[PDB]
UniProtKB/Swiss-Prot annotation, chain A:
GO molecular function terms listed in the Swiss-Prot or TrEMBL record: structural constituent of ribosome
GO BP: any one term: translation
Name used for this protein in its record: Large ribosomal subunit protein bL28
Origin species: Thermus thermophilus (strain ATCC 27634 / DSM 579 / HB8)
Record Pfam families: Ribosomal_L28 (PF00830)
Taxonomic classification: Bacteria, Thermotogati, Deinococcota, Deinococci, Thermales
Domain of life the protein comes from: Bacteria
Family recorded in the similarity comment: Belongs to the bacterial ribosomal protein bL28 family.
Subunit-structure text: Part of the 50S ribosomal subunit.
Swiss-Prot record, chain B:
Keywords: Ribonucleoprotein, Ribosomal protein, RNA-binding, rRNA-binding
Taxon lineage: Bacteria, Thermotogati, Deinococcota, Deinococci, Thermales
Family in the record: Belongs to the bacterial ribosomal protein bL9 family.
Record Gene3D superfamilies: Ribosomal protein L9, C-terminal domain (3.10.430.100), Ribosomal protein L9, N-terminal domain (3.40.5.10)
Organism: Thermus thermophilus (strain ATCC 27634 / DSM 579 / HB8)
Segments forming a coiled coil: none
GO cellular component entries: ribonucleoprotein complex; ribosome
Subunit structure, interactors included: Part of the 50S ribosomal subunit.
Designated name of the protein: Large ribosomal subunit protein bL9
NCBIfam families linked: L9
Length: 97, 146
RNA sequence: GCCCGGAUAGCUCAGGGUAGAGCAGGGGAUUGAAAAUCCCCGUGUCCUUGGUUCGAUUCCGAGUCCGGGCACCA
RNA sequence: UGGGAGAGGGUGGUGGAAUUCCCGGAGUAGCGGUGAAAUGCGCAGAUACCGGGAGGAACGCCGAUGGCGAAGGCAGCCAC
RNA sequence: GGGCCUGACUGCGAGGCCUGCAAGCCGAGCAGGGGCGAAAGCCGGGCCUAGUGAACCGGUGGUCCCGUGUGGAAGGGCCAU
RNA sequence: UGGUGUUGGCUCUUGGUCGCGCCUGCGUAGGAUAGGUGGGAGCCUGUGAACCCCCGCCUCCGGGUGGGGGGGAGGCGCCGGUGAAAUACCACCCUGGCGCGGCUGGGGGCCUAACCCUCGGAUGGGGGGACAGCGCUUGGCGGGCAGUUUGACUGGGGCGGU
RNA sequence: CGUAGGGUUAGGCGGGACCUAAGGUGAAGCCGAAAGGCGUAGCCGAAGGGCAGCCGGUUAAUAUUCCGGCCCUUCCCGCAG
RNA sequence: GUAGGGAAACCGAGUCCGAACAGGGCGCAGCGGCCGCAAAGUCCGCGGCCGUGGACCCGAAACCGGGCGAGCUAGCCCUGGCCAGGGUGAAGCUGGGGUGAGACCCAGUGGAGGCCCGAACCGGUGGGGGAUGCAAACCCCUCGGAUGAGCUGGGGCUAGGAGUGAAAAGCUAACCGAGCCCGGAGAUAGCUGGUUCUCCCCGAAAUGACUUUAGGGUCAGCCUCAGGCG
RNA sequence: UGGUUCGUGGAGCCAUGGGGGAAUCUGGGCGGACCACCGCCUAAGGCUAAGUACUCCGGGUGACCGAUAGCGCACCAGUAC
RNA sequence: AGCCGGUAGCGGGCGUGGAUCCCUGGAUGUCCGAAUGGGGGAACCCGGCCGGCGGGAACGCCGGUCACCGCGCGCGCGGGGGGAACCUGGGGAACUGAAACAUCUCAGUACCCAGAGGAGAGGAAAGAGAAAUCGACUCCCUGAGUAGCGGCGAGCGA
């Protein structure tokens, strides 16, 4: 899953750290690391279809920023977008960011 | 999620009302079917702007209703007819009572907003109801005479 | 180390006001026998200790003993 | 030539009873089985009862000391 | 064998044995508060030589020593195990 | 594989806590079905009393009871008999049990509109359907793959022994 | 082999200004931290399809290429039907 | 450097343990006649040795990264080509017989097949030769397949923990139980080898203890030099 | 989960993939869990010389080499092979 | 005052009317290459449009123009590729060290990729951190192998 078109959120590199043992705070001798290895954390990217100037537009967006799509639809009403392609409509919507 | 209903909706609320729904319902049912709009800030004061405008245009229509309530319960319309002692030969219509008022006291008034079911065919003093909009009726005293 | 349990007759187990039940053991009926069956009979500090109650198997507290279950080990 | 009785044979169709299993409901402490029992099955809800479903095999009463076939053998009902 | 008892002490320790280190061992005497004995005195477990495990990490009871602007707290330290 | 996001609508049936209402509580002796302690010589009934019939009922099956049509001057306490504990009314509560309300949590049925698949027709139709898929997080299985470890003495090493 | 000079001649032979095969590439579109990976059409891609030349002579050295004879293809423009 | 003791608060020529004015641990004080010399200490230079670095030099088998390879070979894809000659003689079909009709039998025709013999082509069985070869796999004789799961030309696709494999861990450009190149990189090697002028004085050890230690180490023993003691 | 000296630690701070999700100075972040008090600073927009690094290039200078040395190459070398 | 490159020679020319030569600007600049009309096995092949050349319509040659993508209202402007090291950002090993090894180390190094430029980054406090103090960021010295971190090991290190 790539990349949020609204926020620019993007996959990140994280470690997966396996630990054994009992935490000092519970009276144990402490935690040991039994493995560290790389992994990725992905944006919760999802699809959002909206009809704008009679045209169907589709965003690939982190669930966090789903509401920011509809906000752009509102602010879009000031522009005249009819006659343009769905490609050119989206370009206009994203300049309003 | 708060939305402004653009229609009365079963067990949701009345038009112009601001109610609270699960996001999926609004953005997947209500909003794509023109049923409501997101209660954002921008189009929130719009609700205000239009509730204020209706409050105006109504209570105006309740004041151009009263500028003709005082100015019509404060006179009589005397209609000289031809008649023998009780009953008229012709009659007086709302249209009649209309052209007559627009003549003497020169007050334009609409015959169909005037409760004259049967045209007047006798002499005497008559009280008649006039509604230039509801809850603002107007009693008209009129004298048909020979 | 921590939590849940149990403990009641020879044996396995049921339960604020009873001490039960089955199976082992005994006699009786019955039979070629061995059983099944049928009558009766026993066999309790209900782990111990201190308190609740008018009273304790029961409630609470505390120990001993045996089960489980979770976790940790420089 | 005209007639008859018949589980004679072959093909296709199709009808109800019963058993089993599956689902739904209702219900609880046993069911099954034997000379007596035990294995088995059952609170993870069996047996017994009611509705639905699936499928195979055999055709109760009629039926008999009966009928048919050369014998082996042939039995729900229908058509050829 | 018996009576009374808890020295199977606390705070220290001259001087030695043994020895690569680190350990292991024996130890008079002084102070506190005791036990036994009339007293001299003895007593810091057991006739003796086996019955054991450095450090790190962590538990517990004390101590009130540090406490990240300050007062507390978290968490350490120290003594004991 | 649980939780949660994307993720919505309508129902049905549940469970858990919290608030209020109403009851349930029968060893023994005794008026009978006595929860605990406390208050307390009066509560009541025209703001409907003793018998009748519908019941939710709970019944240890003797009784308890609520609202109903009955119903038109009457009830039961202090009294006391044996009680460990008096009985009427009031009250805080205990073991339960619904009735409602609060937040909740679970299952079931449906729906369509997110998402998925499909349709020479595509702002649409059909199908699946809030499941699947995909994000974050939980625990598990996991030589399919990876990094490694697999002691020393020894009349050679292993084996045995230590 | 060393030095120097000379030698390879096409509308018809082979390939190109034609076709498409595996494959490759790739408007649309899809996907991936970046690099990139896919992808219908289309395009590319031959020893496959398609397409007009035979015989003889000539040079030291080329020849279906030059020459000789007899044949043929496409493109342009014109005339007739 | 001029103060140390204590875990620390802190005190201070002392401090820590301790109830202690106890004991103990770790600490505290130049040479000659105010001038001179010397000295703590410190700064620079020089030499020995140690730590960190590749650290005396040369040498692995390997591990990791990024690229280069299927013009060899293995499989598949697309498109073409090749297999002398001879032999055997399936089904079917025709006629004849047969029978109630049939099965079936006979002859003729026919030309099937991971059929037979054998060149090309593909192989590589046995022996001999070759063995600083003609040749980093060849030569002679012999032998297997040779219409098929056949052989072969051209165009393509799949590769390094990956491909491909009628399976041998085979093959993936003449050494594959993990290809090749460059890079990390001077990897690491407690091992083996090697270590370069002269003279002079002294001169070992091959034991002990501990050691994933035993042909390697740390301490001690034993050698050497400086200063001091006597 | 990363960054920092900080390897789960008493673990703050800075960053952020997932969930939940404010306020506009009487708002908000920080001073190493947390709380109080006392201070410091104003997040979620952007730009900004110089002082710093390097050496394909030019010049200057060596107790730098002097043809097995010095660059792989003093020479027709990233060549022949 | 000589000159026609290294390069002499054959055979021919030039220069005080200022050559050769050196410096700056300009003109010309086949084909390939980001390569960009299209294609392609780089340096070859095949085109459209406008204008020209030939006898020229077929055929050929000459000149001009024709890729994609981004941004602004078909028109413009911009991008693409390269550069020894250096720089920032996105990814990111292993040998080795720990006398075995996994956490740890090597190291955010090697390396891949994107981007930038003569530099790049950073930068005008939601800072520091105890001074009742300071006052953007960068770079050097020191603070300091300190504070700390650490199978409290090897080491790491403000
Ligand atoms: Mg995990
Ligand atoms: Mg603690
Ligand atoms: Mg850990
Ligand atoms: Mg750890
Ligand atoms: Mg992984
Ligand atoms: Mg998506
Ligand atoms: Mg959506
Ligand atoms: Mg839509
Ligand atoms: Mg989020
Ligand atoms: Mg959210
Ligand atoms: Mg009239
Ligand atoms: Mg306990
Ligand atoms: Mg007949
Ligand atoms: Mg059932
Ligand atoms: Mg059983
Ligand atoms: Mg059972
Ligand atoms: Mg049950
Ligand atoms: Mg069946
Ligand atoms: Mg007969
Ligand atoms: Mg004694
Ligand atoms: Mg005494
Ligand atoms: Mg001593
Ligand atoms: Mg010693
Ligand atoms: Mg000892
Ligand atoms: Mg004493
Ligand atoms: Mg004494
Ligand atoms: Mg005495
Ligand atoms: Mg004495
Ligand atoms: Mg003593
Ligand atoms: Mg003894
Ligand atoms: Mg350790
Ligand atoms: Mg410790
Ligand atoms: Mg403590
Ligand atoms: Mg303090
Ligand atoms: Mg503080
Ligand atoms: Mg305080
Ligand atoms: Mg204090
Ligand atoms: Mg402590
Ligand atoms: Mg502690
Ligand atoms: Mg403490
Ligand atoms: Mg999961
Ligand atoms: Mg969910
Ligand atoms: Mg549904
Ligand atoms: Mg459905
Ligand atoms: Mg739909
Ligand atoms: Mg529909
Ligand atoms: Mg539907
Ligand atoms: Mg659709
Ligand atoms: Mg649809
Ligand atoms: Mg649909
Ligand atoms: Mg789901
Ligand atoms: Mg969760
Ligand atoms: Mg997991
Ligand atoms: Mg395993
Ligand atoms: Mg393995
Ligand atoms: Mg697996
Ligand atoms: Mg493997
Ligand atoms: Mg080991
Ligand atoms: Mg050995
Ligand atoms: Mg040996
Ligand atoms: Mg041996
Ligand atoms: Mg020996
Ligand atoms: Mg020997
Ligand atoms: Mg030997
Ligand atoms: Mg052994
Ligand atoms: Mg020659
Ligand atoms: Mg020639
Ligand atoms: Mg010709
Ligand atoms: Mg042409
Ligand atoms: Mg072509
Ligand atoms: Mg083509
Ligand atoms: Mg591409
Ligand atoms: Mg595209
Ligand atoms: Mg591609
Ligand atoms: Mg394709
Ligand atoms: Mg073409
Ligand atoms: Mg091609
Ligand atoms: Mg082509
Ligand atoms: Mg061709
Ligand atoms: Mg063909
Ligand atoms: Mg051809
Ligand atoms: Mg041709
Ligand atoms: Mg011809
Ligand atoms: Mg000639
Ligand atoms: Mg020739
Ligand atoms: Mg010829
Ligand atoms: Mg000719
Ligand atoms: Mg014509
Ligand atoms: Mg100190
Ligand atoms: Mg003290
Ligand atoms: Mg002292
Ligand atoms: Mg002292
Ligand atoms: Mg000095
Ligand atoms: Mg040294
Ligand atoms: Mg080094
Ligand atoms: Mg050295
Ligand atoms: Mg390795
Ligand atoms: Mg390995
Ligand atoms: Mg690679
Ligand atoms: Mg390659
Ligand atoms: Mg091949
Ligand atoms: Mg090949
Ligand atoms: Mg072929
Ligand atoms: Mg053949
Ligand atoms: Mg043949
Ligand atoms: Mg043949
Ligand atoms: Mg023959
Ligand atoms: Mg043949
Ligand atoms: Mg013959
Ligand atoms: Mg024949
Ligand atoms: Mg023949
Ligand atoms: Mg035939
Ligand atoms: Mg025949
Ligand atoms: Mg034949
Ligand atoms: Mg044949
Ligand atoms: Mg054959
Ligand atoms: Mg033969
Ligand atoms: Mg053969
Ligand atoms: Mg054969
Ligand atoms: Mg043969
Ligand atoms: Mg061959
Ligand atoms: Mg061969
Ligand atoms: Mg051979
Ligand atoms: Mg032979
Ligand atoms: Mg041989
Ligand atoms: Mg050989
Ligand atoms: Mg040969
Ligand atoms: Mg031969
Ligand atoms: Mg031969
Ligand atoms: Mg042969
Ligand atoms: Mg042969
Ligand atoms: Mg053959
Ligand atoms: Mg043949
Ligand atoms: Mg074939
Ligand atoms: Mg082939
Ligand atoms: Mg082929
Ligand atoms: Mg080949
Ligand atoms: Mg090829
Ligand atoms: Mg490949
Ligand atoms: Mg393949
Ligand atoms: Mg490999
Ligand atoms: Mg590799
Ligand atoms: Mg493989
Ligand atoms: Mg093969
Ligand atoms: Mg090679
Ligand atoms: Mg090779
Ligand atoms: Mg090979
Ligand atoms: Mg091999
Ligand atoms: Mg390997
Ligand atoms: Mg490997
Ligand atoms: Mg290898
Ligand atoms: Mg190879
Ligand atoms: Mg090579
Ligand atoms: Mg490289
Ligand atoms: Mg490198
Ligand atoms: Mg290295
Ligand atoms: Mg090295
Ligand atoms: Mg080396
Ligand atoms: Mg090694
Ligand atoms: Mg070694
Ligand atoms: Mg050597
Ligand atoms: Mg040597
Ligand atoms: Mg000497
Ligand atoms: Mg000597
Ligand atoms: Mg020795
Ligand atoms: Mg030795
Ligand atoms: Mg050891
Ligand atoms: Mg060893
Ligand atoms: Mg050895
Ligand atoms: Mg060994
Ligand atoms: Mg040796
Ligand atoms: Mg060794
Ligand atoms: Mg030594
Ligand atoms: Mg000596
Ligand atoms: Mg010495
Ligand atoms: Mg001396
Ligand atoms: Mg002497
Ligand atoms: Mg970290
Ligand atoms: Mg951290
Ligand atoms: Mg860090
Ligand atoms: Mg820093
Ligand atoms: Mg931290
Ligand atoms: Mg804070
Ligand atoms: Mg914070
Ligand atoms: Mg924060
Ligand atoms: Mg975040
Ligand atoms: Mg405000
Ligand atoms: Mg403020
Ligand atoms: Mg605030
Ligand atoms: Mg903050
Ligand atoms: Mg701060
Ligand atoms: Mg603080
Ligand atoms: Mg601040
Ligand atoms: Mg602000
Ligand atoms: Mg900022
Ligand atoms: Mg800047
Ligand atoms: Mg700067
Ligand atoms: Mg230079
Ligand atoms: Mg120079
Ligand atoms: Mg030379
Ligand atoms: Mg050289
Ligand atoms: Mg020389
Ligand atoms: Mg030299
Ligand atoms: Mg150079
Ligand atoms: Mg050079
Ligand atoms: Mg050289
Ligand atoms: Mg050279
Ligand atoms: Mg050369
Ligand atoms: Mg001349
Ligand atoms: Mg001349
Ligand atoms: Mg001359
Ligand atoms: Mg002049
Ligand atoms: Mg001049
Ligand atoms: Mg120029
Ligand atoms: Mg081009
Ligand atoms: Mg191209
Ligand atoms: Mg033209
Ligand atoms: Mg001409
Ligand atoms: Mg022309
Ligand atoms: Mg042309
Ligand atoms: Mg052109
Ligand atoms: Mg590029
Ligand atoms: Mg550039
Ligand atoms: Mg860098
Ligand atoms: Mg970076
Ligand atoms: Mg990796
Ligand atoms: Mg690592
Ligand atoms: Mg490593
Ligand atoms: Mg390793
Ligand atoms: Mg190292
Ligand atoms: Mg190591
Ligand atoms: Mg090592
Ligand atoms: Mg190893
Ligand atoms: Mg390692
Ligand atoms: Mg690590
Ligand atoms: Mg390194
Ligand atoms: Mg690191
Ligand atoms: Mg980097
Ligand atoms: Mg580098
Ligand atoms: Mg500069
Ligand atoms: Mg700058
Ligand atoms: Mg500012
Ligand atoms: Mg600011
Ligand atoms: Mg300021
Ligand atoms: Mg600052
Ligand atoms: Mg200030
Ligand atoms: Mg300092
Ligand atoms: Mg560190
Ligand atoms: Mg480290
Ligand atoms: Mg670190
Ligand atoms: Mg580091």
């Amino acid at each position: 899953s790539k990349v949020c078109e609204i926020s620019g959120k993007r996959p990140i590199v994280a470690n997966s750290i396996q630990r054994r043992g009992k935490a000092k705070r519970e009276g144990g001798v402490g935690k040991k690391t039994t493995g560290i290895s790389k992994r990725r954390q992905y944006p919760n990217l999802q699809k959002v279809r909206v009809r704008v100037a009679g045209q169907e537009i589709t965003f690939r967006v982190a669930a966090s920023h789903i509401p920011k799509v509809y906000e752009l639809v509102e602010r879009a009403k000031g522009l005249k977008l009819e006659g343009l392609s769905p490609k050119e409509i989206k370009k206009e919507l994203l300049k309003l960011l | 999620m708060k939305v402004i209903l653009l229609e009365p909706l079963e067990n949701l609320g009345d038009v112009g009302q601001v109610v609270d729904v699960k996001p999926g319902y609004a953005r997947n049912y209500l909003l794509p079917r023109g049923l409501a709009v997101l209660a954002t800030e921008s189009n929130l004061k719009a609700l205000e702007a239009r509730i204020r405008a209706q409050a105006k245009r109504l209570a105006e229509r309740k004041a151009e209703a009263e500028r003709l309530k005082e100015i019509l319960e404060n006179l009589t319309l005397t209609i000289p007819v031809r008649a023998g002692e009780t009953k008229i030969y012709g009659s007086v219509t709302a249209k009649d009572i209309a052209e007559a008022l627009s003549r003497q006291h020169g007050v334009t008034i609409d015959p169909k907003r005037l409760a004259l079911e049967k045209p007047i065919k006798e002499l005497g003093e008559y009280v008649l109801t006039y509604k230039p909009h509801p809850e603002v009726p107007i009693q008209l005293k009129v004298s048909v005479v020979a």
